[PDB]
């Protein structure tokens, strides 16, 4: 589980671009304030390898 991939982002990337921001994703109108919850998911998921 040391390999991670980003799942949520507001806008697509330009060619050859790198994003390492770990702020809590906002999916609704209410702010997340750095706390997970409804419409508040961690942008990057994990990779299951078995």
């Amino acid at each position: 589980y040391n390999y991670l991939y980003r799942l949520f982002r507001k806008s697509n990337l330009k060619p050859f671009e790198r994003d390492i921001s770990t702020e809590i994703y906002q999916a609704g109108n209410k702010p997340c304030n750095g706390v997970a919850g409804f419409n508040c998911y961690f942008p990057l998921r994990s990779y299951s390898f078995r």
Epitope: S46, S48, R50
Partner: nanobody
Framework: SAVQLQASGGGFVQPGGSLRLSCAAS????????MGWFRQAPGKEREFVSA????????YYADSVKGRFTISRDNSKNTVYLQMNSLRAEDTATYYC????????????????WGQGTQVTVSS
């Protein structure tokens, strides 16, 4: 799969006391994935605490907590409960509600989602 986990309970208690924790799961998943609780201390790694299935058939507790922690599943509101009794100082840490999406839990290694940290402090 899209599972949202909510954790309830926690706070400050005294050694030897009793407490109740709970986790609720919402959304959709691959199957009736099991539900468990982990515990992480400041400066240390996460530790397996408890694991139960979606129909209250398999109970799994860590060796260091065998016969002391209890986990149960409700019948009508989908919320899993973790009954805690006779706490000591080593139980002061942050608990997390862990979900794994498969029918049979060979090991606790495959984790797909986590839960909000619930602080449980045991002190005089």
């Amino acid at each position: 799969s899209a599972v949202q986990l909510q954790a309830s309970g926690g706070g400050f208690v005294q050694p030897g006391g009793s407490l109740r924790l709970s986790c609720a799961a919402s959304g959709w998943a691959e199957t009736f994935g099991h539900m468990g609780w982990f515990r992480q201390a400041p400066g240390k790694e996460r530790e397996f605490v408890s694991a139960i299935d979606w129909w209250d058939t398999v109970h799994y507790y860590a060796d260091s907590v065998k016969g002391r922690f209890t986990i149960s599943r409700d019948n009508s509101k989908n919320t899993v409960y973790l009954q805690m009794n006779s706490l000591r100082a080593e139980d002061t840490a942050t608990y997390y509600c862990a979900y794994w999406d498969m029918d049979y839990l060979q090991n606790s290694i495959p984790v797909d989602y986590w839960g909000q940290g619930t602080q449980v402090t045991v002190s005089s």
